């Protein structure tokens, strides 16, 4: 995020980090329950990648994070990589995340849920802070 | 250029109609735009959330999908519209 601000450690308990085998952060994700993570189809996650929960500072070695294995990758069949439409992937975890003060689920809306233009929302992540 | 610590940013939702001024025909029904307010999602942010507080709870409204190749803070970010995909998420969770 460009022009963002550092968050309060653990205040976005659903925010996960997708990391490859080498420890490289490549995409964000959100826990929707203990066994499932929602992410972007285009992140191209495989079962060799790891889900990291309860993390704040990727630099620290003293935080109590959960490194969760991926059991299966569910790419929405409607996903059109050409148009990047319906860009969603579900990740089914091998071991269930342990909910704590720093790891919990975000709520999903109903299909009829209305989010009007002008509504202030929030986005989070470890993406570049400067291009 | 990658942060060790988790970043956050407040941003407004736009209408698909209004987002088409920036992205034209690239905006489909299953997409929702946000930003163009001095902030921007950037490389590495993808797959993450766009949440809106409602009736007191944070609700997943979008998924960081695509945007400006330069993470321009004056152009809208594109997110997967969760309302259009929630039924599939529910069918998938049910069945697995």
């Amino acid at each position: 995020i460009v022009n963002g601000e550092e968050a309060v450690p653990g205040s976005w308990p659903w925010q996960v980090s997708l990391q490859d085998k080498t420890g490289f952060h490549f995409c964000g994700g959100s826990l929707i329950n203990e066994n499932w993570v929602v992410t972007a189809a285009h992140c191209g996650v495989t079962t060799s990648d790891v889900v990291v929960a309860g993390e704040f500072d990727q630099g620290s070695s003293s935080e109590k994070i959960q490194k969760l294995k991926i059991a299966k990758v569910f790419k929405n069949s409607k996903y059109n990589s050409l148009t990047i439409n319906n860009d969603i992937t579900l990740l089914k975890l091998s071991t269930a995340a342990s909910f704590s003060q720093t790891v919990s689920a975000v709520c999903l809306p109903s299909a009829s849920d209305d989010f009007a233009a002008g509504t202030t929302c929030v986005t989070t992540g470890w993406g570049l802070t400067r291009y | 250029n990658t942060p060790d610590r988790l970043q956050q940013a407040s941003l407004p939702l736009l209408s698909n109609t209004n987002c088409k001024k920036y992205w034209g025909t690239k905006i489909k029904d299953a997409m929702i735009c946000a930003g163009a307010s001095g902030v921007s999602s950037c490389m590495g942010d993808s797959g993450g959330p766009l949440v809106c507080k409602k009736n007191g709870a944070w609700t997943l409204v979008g998924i960081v999908s695509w945007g400006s190749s330069t993470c321009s803070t004056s152009t809208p970010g594109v997110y997967a519209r969760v309302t259009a995909l929630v039924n599939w998420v529910q069918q998938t969770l049910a069945a697995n």
Binding site: G10, A105, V122 | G56, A57, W58
Partner: peptide, 10 residues
Amino acid sequence: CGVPAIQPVL
């Protein structure tokens, strides 16, 4: 869901 134990400060 969607109610953090540690409140975000925006």
